[PDB]
Design a protein around this ligand. Structure first.
Ligand SMILES: C=C(C)CCOP(=O)(O)OP(=O)(O)O
Ligand SMILES: C=C(C)CCOP(=O)(O)OP(=O)(O)O
Ligand SMILES: C=C(C)CCOP(=O)(O)OP(=O)(O)O
Ligand SMILES: C=C(C)CCOP(=O)(O)OP(=O)(O)O
Ligand SMILES: [Mn+2]
Ligand SMILES: [Mn+2]
Ligand SMILES: [Mn+2]
Ligand SMILES: [Mn+2]
Ligand SMILES: [Mn+2]
Ligand SMILES: [Mn+2]
Lengths: 342, 340
């Protein structure tokens, strides 16, 4: 349901994650510093992935099996996803040369961090397998959960690589900016870790190992992932940095974003040359010239129309879900993200 | 095993399968073909001591009658999982230490159209070893312990790296904290766990040796060999031939808490100590050459050569004291007097 009481239930676990990873008695300098890394980077987001892990479980598990112990375990799995999100955001902000994350200067920009952000990134990722070891190592779901986290990370790395290959020799490859390429990027970059991981982690905690059941969840959770990333791409250019918590860099970094794809689809020959000349430039005047074209092409209105159609199209596909999977779970995910401004 | 040609041929024959197993996700050939390039350029170009050690350890810890071609090749695949971890750590390290060359070629992040994308490749190469472990070990009792060992050693290595990186604050090195105590802590976490304990511990788990005391006996002697090994690397950074070592040292420029910088301060007169304060951890080429000229004036090359001989003999005395001694003698014989 994504309610005040669940947000308070979830934030109550976080102190214990910090204690489990920091409280290696011969290097207190580093354990104390890693508490700061966790405190800064892990808990200040919307925590949708982590809260979806708990909601997924509660709606897949048999009502009679929903003990306070079993709910807490779903809470700890959640925070393991947020640990992965944290690691990915530390790296992403370095690679995309971002200014602000979640309302604060990006970790790598801070006084004595810089490239040390690369090590923190890797440290925050490996720390979740330590949390998994302490709480799940005596449960049937231990190996499958470990393997899902390894597979999802590998797939997320490939997403991030395909995302980075938008530029060669300082200029974007606008000829290759297709909706086919776009769909491949968000599938691997976003959908696997953001949407599949929480729901699958819910299924494994409930002992739901049926391959066809996971396959039915995957198909709709990929559609939701695409829908989600298109929202992120819109906000990067037209969002309020005060509300979103970040300054957009998609245009400056010359990303194959949903905006850039649709811009090219609808551009006249003079508008295409603008894109050629000014897309993916370090100059502020170029970024504004591109945003001005985006405005000119009615991409705000175009996004808003798509969002509403896509919401309805996805809902129709959720009503057709089979293999005894709960519909409401997927309606509840869509309700939480539909028309978001952060 | 004895680090022989045939053992390098046996170990290099598995590598094509590792690249096949990770790259041959059919809807994105652009990324899988690029990752085959990332692997080819970053994994097998080292000496491969860690990976070859993992095979040698197993051969010497497993019962002679249980050494099948199947079991030896599994120890090899474990060897490559160690070389994948190494490959990922080196990509990250070169970005952080602002290094020019690695293994005779430009550092990965300096290559045309890499840059900060080297941060993704770093992460991507580490996660790829857990895909290899899954395929070949998921049915064995040693699966979970081997998964966990890697996770633990990675976490430990990350903490090593951080301590190493806190040598500087506000552009100046913290020379008053450059002790042998701090140094022994850096190398323990940064080098010894993944370079020496990991191969041997993997060879034990594949031989179904789960006795904690046996892992604790091996650990004690392998921690000594790691400290020895890192001191050798610290000497080469400043006095090594870059054409031979394959890398241009940056320890003086980055103001690292290296053995050389620790011993320099221990023996420095008050004029020599101010030279360090003024010129250590400076980007300017003239500052790096002044420090190397001070290092030569404190007879540090002769100091290292004496230490290397002493420690080599002291460790051999510790090895003599049901684990196979020749394993630890053969590792020490490989790295003793090395110039790369
Ligand atoms: C996949 C993307 C777009 C990264 C950010 O995800 P969120 O927008 O959910 O970020 P937080 O709330 O966790 O900061
Ligand atoms: C792997 C991640 C973080 C998802 C997409 O990255 P983006 O770069 O598009 O994410 P934001 O910085 O816009 O949150
Ligand atoms: C921990 C250190 C000093 C990294 C280099 O190790 P090696 O000198 O074994 O590197 P390669 O053989 O793999 O190049
Ligand atoms: C690679 C790791 C984690 C060890 C760090 O040692 P260095 O930073 O000195 O590595 P080299 O360049 O000397 O190989
Ligand atoms: Mn970004
Ligand atoms: Mn990005
Ligand atoms: Mn974005
Ligand atoms: Mn280093
Ligand atoms: Mn280095
Ligand atoms: Mn070195």
């Amino acid at each position: 349901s994504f309610s005040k009481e669940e947000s308070r239930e979830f934030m109550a676990i976080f102190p214990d994650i910090v204690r489990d990873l920091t409280d290696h008695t011969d290097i207190p300098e580093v354990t104390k510093r890693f508490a700061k890394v966790l405190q800064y980077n892990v808990p200040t987001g919307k925590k949708t992935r982590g809260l979806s892990t708990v909601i997924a479980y509660k709606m897949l598990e048999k009502p009679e099996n929903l003990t306070p112990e079993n709910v807490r375990l779903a809470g700890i799995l959640g925070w393991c996803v947020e640990l992965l999100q944290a690691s990915l955001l530390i790296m992403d902000d370095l690679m995309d040369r971002s200014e602000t994350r979640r309302g604060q200067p990006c970790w790598y920009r801070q006084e004595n961090v810089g490239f040390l952000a690369i090590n923190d990134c890797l440290h925050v990722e490996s720390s979740l397998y330590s949390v998994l070891r302490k709480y799940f190592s005596h449960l049937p779901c231990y190996v499958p959960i470990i393997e899902l986290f390894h597979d999802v990370n590998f797939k997320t790395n490939m997403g991030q690589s395909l995302d980075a290959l938008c530029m060669k020799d300082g200029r974007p490859i606008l000829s290759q900016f297709t909706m086919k390429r776009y769909s491949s990027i968000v599938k691997y970059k976003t959908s696997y870790y953001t949407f599949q991981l929480p729901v699958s982690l819910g299924m494994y905690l409930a002992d739901m190992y049926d391959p066809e059941q996971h396959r039915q969840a995957k198909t709709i959770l990929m559609e939701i992932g695409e829908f989600f990333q298109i929202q992120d791409d819109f906000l990067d250019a037209f969002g309020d940095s005060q509300v979103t918590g970040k300054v957009g860099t998609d245009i400056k970094e010359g990303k194959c974003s949903w905006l850039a794809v649709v811009a090219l689809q609808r551009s006249n020959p003079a508008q295409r040359q603008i894109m050629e000349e000014h897309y993916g430039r370090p100059e502020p005047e170029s970024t504004q010239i591109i945003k001005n074209l985006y405005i000119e092409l009615g991409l705000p209105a175009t996004f808003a129309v798509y969002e509403e159609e896509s919401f309805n199209i996805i809902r129709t596909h959720i009503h057709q879900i089979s293999k005894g999977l709960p519909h409401d779970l997927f309606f509840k995910i869509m309700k939480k993200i539909y028309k978001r401004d952060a």
